[PDB]
Structure formats: C-alpha cells, structure tokens
C-alpha cells in the first residue's frame, strides 16, 4: 500500500521518467539479442531479464476471439526486472538475481506459453 500513497505514486504511462512506449521499445530486443540475457544498464538502473522470442516458425519452444488472435499474433514476451545495485556489488546482485529468480521464472513462463497459451 505504500506504493499507492499520494507522495509515492506515478502515472501508469511513466516508468522511472520514461514512457511506456519507449521502455517497451528498448526492452524489446532484436532476434539476435533475445533468448539470452538482456543485462541493460542506463544510469544506476539495470534492466535485467530473459526475453523469450518465437523461432523461425510459430514455435515458442522445441520439444472471446481476441485471445486467440493475440496468441497467434504475439512473437515475444519479456519479464524485465529493474535493479539498482551499488557499483561495487553489481556483478554479485545481478548474477544471483538472474541465476535464482529470472531464469527459472522465464523458462516456466515459456513452457506454459508453449503448451497452453
């Protein structure tokens, strides 16, 4: 509830002095920078995640009608965590967060999207 207090609230359209369109743009990499780590740092702000991108075919992984349309139209989903580690502990905090939280969560999300959207 402290995230929704009057002194601690920002508009939905703005994320850390950035608009949602620009964040959605630069947190959406190309095909060569997807399906791997996306350790992106702007200024004391590490945008970290494991984007999952569709292959050459429509396959997500290899072994209401708007819902099916979005399932057949989507090609990438990304779960991006914003971190602010100190400059002396970047390589520890980012590495443990990617190893213990982001990787397993994104792989499970990719699996559940692959089987039943």
């Amino acid at each position: 509830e402290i995230f929704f207090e009057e002194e601690n609230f920002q508009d939905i359209n703005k994320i850390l002095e950035f608009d949602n369109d620009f964040v959605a743009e630069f947190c959406s990499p190309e095909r060569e920078m997807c399906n791997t780590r996306f350790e992106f740092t702007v200024d004391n702000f590490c945008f970290l995640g494991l984007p999952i991108h569709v292959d050459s075919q429509g396959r997500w992984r290899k072994s209401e009608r708007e819902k099916e349309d979005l399932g057949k139209n989507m090609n990438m989903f990304h779960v991006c965590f914003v971190m602010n580690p100190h400059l002396i502990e970047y390589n520890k905090r980012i590495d443990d967060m990617y190893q213990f939280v982001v990787t397993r969560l994104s792989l499970l999300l990719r699996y559940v999207q692959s089987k039943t959207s």
Binding site: V23, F45, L70, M74, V82, M83, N84, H86
Partner: peptide, 17 residues
C-alpha cells in the same frame, strides 16, 4: 536490490507494456 517488474510483449502492432 530490486525496484520493479515489467511485462513487455511484442505483438505485430508494435511493442507494448
């Protein structure tokens, strides 16, 4: 040192949050 999470999907109409 976590601050937040975003769910960014990329449809054929462009990326969005």
């Amino acid at each position: 040192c976590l601050l937040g999470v975003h769910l960014v999907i990329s449809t054929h109409s462009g990326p969005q949050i």
